[PDB]
Sequence to fold (368 residues):
Amino acid sequence: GPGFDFAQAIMKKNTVIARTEKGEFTMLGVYDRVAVIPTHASVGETIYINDVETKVLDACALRDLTDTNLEITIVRLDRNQKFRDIRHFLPRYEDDYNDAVLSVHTSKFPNMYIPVGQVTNYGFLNLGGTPTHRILMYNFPTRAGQAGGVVTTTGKVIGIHVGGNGAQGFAAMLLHSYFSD
Amino acid sequence: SGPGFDFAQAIMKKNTVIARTEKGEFTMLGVYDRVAVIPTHASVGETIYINDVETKVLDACALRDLTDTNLEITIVRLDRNQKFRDIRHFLPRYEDDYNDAVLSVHTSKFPNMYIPVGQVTNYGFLNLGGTPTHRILMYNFPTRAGQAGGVVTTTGKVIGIHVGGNGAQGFAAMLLHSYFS
Amino acid sequence: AKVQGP
Fold:
């Protein structure tokens, strides 16, 4: 299929298993030594990348123009490998999507590929008492340990999984402007 | 682990078709020759669409055990020219529990789905939609409608096909080598 | 449990 082949290429080439004090997360490498992870991971001065302690050169919890949390934390890693540049796969603006796939890879959820289908630009969301913006929503019974999962469509990496409420899953948008220029 | 995911992918690529009956699309596992299996509640008829190709059902057998209790497995002989790769040597010979299992589904609704469902436990009994059923496997994953027929595998073992769920757990009918002796 | 076909 078209979605699965692309999703698997992003997972194999541009993801690592990140482990913080909060546990295991799927982490997407975007370019150079820059990666993203849900802010609730509570990243620190060091982080385990595929079971190798790695120095965190920089970490920035993103906020929008309204100073509202986006639940995405950009991380610059002190590692030898450089991520393949996938910024041209990132959407340029907020949108809705169809035929989306959620891909997760952790010790608990290894090689998980879920066609979630329709993805809605929900926008505002109170995530555990924290106002959040730019949230995508899909119908999927979420479970703990999937935070950081990559949401892709036909040829685009559109967001990362940040939470859910039993029957719906929520992802933070990935936008080209976050990493460009 | 990669072996499990790779094995599941191989089974799906070589030994599965999209079967459509009057009830909808099911994941169908090919076992050997022109023999395949599908959950009995799919209501196989004189004809069945195999990847959108009307195929005559040369014979069908809804399996029941020595107690005349439903097993939810229907063996079907298909009038086709292609021959399924013989996978009967991957079928367990007796009832057992398994670890690190994968549920794999392929339909128009769930294309190329791969779910690490974890530990699998066998129960002699399940009341499936009011129908007493025997030789059942349970896993703790919120499976949903449209996944019936999905293949349950571990590395080197094709152990069952998905048949139902309760919202929080999934249930598969067990595949045994003696069914295809 | 309930049969979970299409």
